[PDB]
């Protein structure tokens, strides 16, 4: 479920900037973004009988809010800063520094480096609900897991480092 | 790491003149950079050629450099980084100069400041103070992230 390694071709005057260990970090954020697009589109392409729709909006809002967090709040803020920073490049080395100080902070704001089995695994195991519910189209046993895992996510994330309060509302 | 050593200070040199020496040194370490560096050197080079130590000339030259550095450092502080607005914000919040906000903050956050202290109460009183800032709706831009409750 987690594959699709992507690479690209860099000429030598650019090869010193976009290094070989740089491609992997870009591929990492690509893989997690694709999983978020998967869940968001999988709960969107379709259109106690209607009781499934209550669970639908109650889960679709959550995955939509996480996508609106990651892309707008992180993947567009630091990029908008990063373009305004690379237009004032005055040195060979500080261009590498301003690029690495975009990568190593976009890998920290999007929680992927550390605290994985403490925080990030919760978002993964609730994405498994967006798979399981998408296939079936037991219902009462879904909300007992969903309220529990959502409250687990909030009561684990409540330790907030300060930028997680942008999503802590829901 | 910059201070007078009173035991090494020569007796004919008083403490007051050396305090002026200290002030101009701390200021220029921390001006109007109009380059009287060589002319005050030419003042101090001329003062080297004099045989006999005269105090009132030594007092006059340092107090000239004392006033010139302090006349600038006033002008930079009071005009470019205006102090009158800063002292107003200090009186408005440390000395309760804002009456509508601080009465509403006591009104809105009465129970949760009544309750005994515990590590999570700090964020609770800040968001209520932030609510109190918008309860008294008068709100400009920034003005708020220079103050928090501890």
């Amino acid at each position: 479920l987690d594959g699709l390694t992507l690479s690209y071709k860099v000429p030598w005057p650019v090869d010193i900037v976009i290094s070989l260990e740089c491609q992997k970090i870009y591929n990492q954020v690509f893989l997690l973004l694709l999983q978020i697009k998967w869940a968001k589109y999988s709960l969107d392409v379709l259109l106690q009988i209607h009781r499934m729709f209550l669970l639908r909006v109650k889960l679709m809002h959550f995955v939509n809010s996480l996508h609106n967090y990651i892309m707008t709040r992180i993947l567009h803020s630091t990029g908008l800063e990063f373009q305004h920073q690379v237009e004032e490049a005055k040195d060979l080395d500080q261009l590498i520094k301003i690029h690495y100080r975009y990568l190593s902070t976009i890998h920290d704001r999007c929680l992927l480096r550390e605290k994985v089995s403490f925080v990030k695994e919760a978002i993964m195991k609730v994405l498994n609900l967006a798979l399981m519910f998408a296939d079936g189209w037991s219902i009462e046993k879904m909300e007992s897991d969903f309220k529990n895992c959502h409250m687990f996510l909030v009561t684990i994330l409540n330790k907030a480092f300060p930028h997680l309060e942008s999503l802590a509302l829901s | 790491q910059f201070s007078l050593r009173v035991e090494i200070l020569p007796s004919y040199i008083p403490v007051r003149v050396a305090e002026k020496i200290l002030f101009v040194g701390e200021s220029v370490q921390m001006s109007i950079l109009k380059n009287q560096e060589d002319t005050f050197a030419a003042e101090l080079h001329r003062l080297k050629q004099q045989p006999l130590f005269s105090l009132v000339d030594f007092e006059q030259v340092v107090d000239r450099i004392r006033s010139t550095v302090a006349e600038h450092l006033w002008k930079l502080m009071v005009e470019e980084s205006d102090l009158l607005g800063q002292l107003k914000i200090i009186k408005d919040f440390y000395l309760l100069g804002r009456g509508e906000l601080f009465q509403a903050f006591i009104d809105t956050a009465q129970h949760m400041l009544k309750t005994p202290p515990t590590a999570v109460t700090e964020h609770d009183v800040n968001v209520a103070f932030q609510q109190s800032a918008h309860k008294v709706l008068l709100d400009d831009d920034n003005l708020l992230p220079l103050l928090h409750l501890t």
Partner: protein
């Protein structure tokens, strides 16, 4: 917090119209409610903040047999007051009976602005005592509002009519209003048509167009009584904390007025306090004494002089009071607005609880007592007699207002520690 104003009756709608126009000019507001290019003030308590900065007053305009309300509508300021809350006899009983049938829709008009506000603080009424349609309906609405809002307070800017004594049933009408106000109004600020007319003859030559020009005097009092709430700072920010010092007894809640520059068209604080305590600047027509005195000054006031001024006035003893209370005169300060004339750079007002207003109550009680022995105007109209066959609400009002007179003179006595 935010305060909703219940202007009612023809005269009360006139003074509320003028009051909101003066706050339009004084604050940064146009006749269309929009902020202007030329214009730090707590605007929110007296003005609802809309989205495109349309500071609309929370005014509730009640019309009953409307004439002057259409004249209010064809004004340049008609867009300024748009909460869209205007809903369609000279006897108190006629006004009461006309208010009873439309009480539910005018009260829904109250409810909507109460939902619009964050927290409601008080209902300030531009009431007209013995004002035909205004009296009766104002007493009935006053009786409804404290029941529906028991924690909340009601102030009344009563224009108490003294025109050297045309309404022949004016003592009856005023008599019923004062009973309703004494039990069902937390505060009342009193004003007198003869006192404002004597001040009009003093400061100007205006005698015949008395009402139109006295509107401006009433509006200056009404604006300066709320200036310290409207502007920022820690000088009595809310209404009730100001109210508590002025009113020291549940029964005696009537407040007299005065203005140091009656001709407001440098002066130190000693001068303006001494001028204020004189009876010409007072706008109200056995020992007698104040119960509690307060003053507010707005302008170019030096701060260190005010304690010397407070001691100097105290040694002058221009204001004589010997109440049961230990209350003292209190000097308060506010800022004069920009963009308006700053003429008479220092300028002030007083509010105080005085036992002399019991005489003005007793005057219309004396007129009522004479008219009640004569029975010359019982009115005997079928509205009047079917509404009160017993005619005993006048006697209950007489015994309640007689309790009020006796309580005032008992407050003059050394033993208002006991029952009044």
């Amino acid at each position: 917090r935010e305060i909703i104003t219940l202007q009612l009756g023809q005269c009360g709608n006139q003074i509320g119209f003028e009051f909101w126009k003066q706050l339009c000019a004084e604050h940064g507001i146009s006749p269309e409610g929009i902020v202007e290019e030329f214009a730090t003030d707590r605007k929110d308590v007296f003005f609802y903040q809309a989205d495109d900065e349309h500071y609309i007053p929370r005014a509730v305009l009640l019309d009953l047999e409307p004439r002057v309300i259409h004249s209010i509508l064809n004004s340049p300021y008609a867009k300024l007051y748009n909460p869209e809350n205007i809903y369609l006899g000279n006897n108190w009983a006629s006004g009461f009976s006309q208010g009873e049938k439309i009480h539910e829709d005018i009260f829904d008009i109250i409810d909507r602005e109460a939902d619009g506000s964050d927290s409601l603080e008080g209902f300030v009424l531009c009431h007209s005592i013995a004002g035909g349609t205004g009296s009766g309906l104002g007493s009935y609405l006053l009786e409804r509002l404290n029941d529906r809002y028991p924690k909340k307070l009601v102030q009344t800017y009563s224009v108490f009519p003294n025109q050297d004594e045309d309404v022949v049933v004016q003592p009856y009408n005023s008599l019923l209003t004062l009973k309703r106000l004494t039990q069902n109004a937390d505060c009342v600020v009193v004003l007198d048509n003869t006192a404002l007319n004597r001040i009009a003859t003093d400061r100007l030559h205006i005698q015949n167009p008395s009402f139109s020009q006295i509107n401006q005097l009433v509006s200056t009092i009404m604006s300066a009584s709320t200036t310290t709430l409207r502007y920022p700072g820690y000088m009595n920010n809310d209404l009730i904390g100001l109210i508590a010092s002025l009113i020291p007894t549940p029964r005696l809640h009537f407040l007299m007025t005065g203005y140091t520059p009656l001709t407001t068209d440098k002066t130190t604080v000693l001068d303006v306090m001494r001028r204020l305590l004189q009876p010409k600047n007072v706008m109200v027509s056995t020992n007698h004494c104040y119960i509690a005195i307060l003053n507010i000054i707005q302008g170019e006031v030096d701060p260190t002089q005010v304690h010397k001024s407070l001691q100097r006035i105290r040694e002058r003893k221009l204001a004589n009071f010997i109440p049961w209370g230990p209350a003292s005169i209190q000097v308060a300060l506010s800022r004069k607005s920009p963009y308006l004339p700053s003429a008479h750079r220092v300028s002030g007002l007083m509010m105080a609880n005085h036992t002399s207003i019991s005489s003005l109550f007793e005057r219309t009680c004396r007129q009522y007592d004479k008219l009640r022995k004569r029975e010359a105007f019982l009115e005997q109209f079928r509205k009047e007699d079917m509404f009160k066959d017993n005619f005993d609400e006048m006697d209950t009002s007489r015994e309640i207002v007689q309790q009020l007179i006796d309580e005032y003179h008992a407050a003059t006595r050394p033993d208002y520690i006991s029952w009044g």
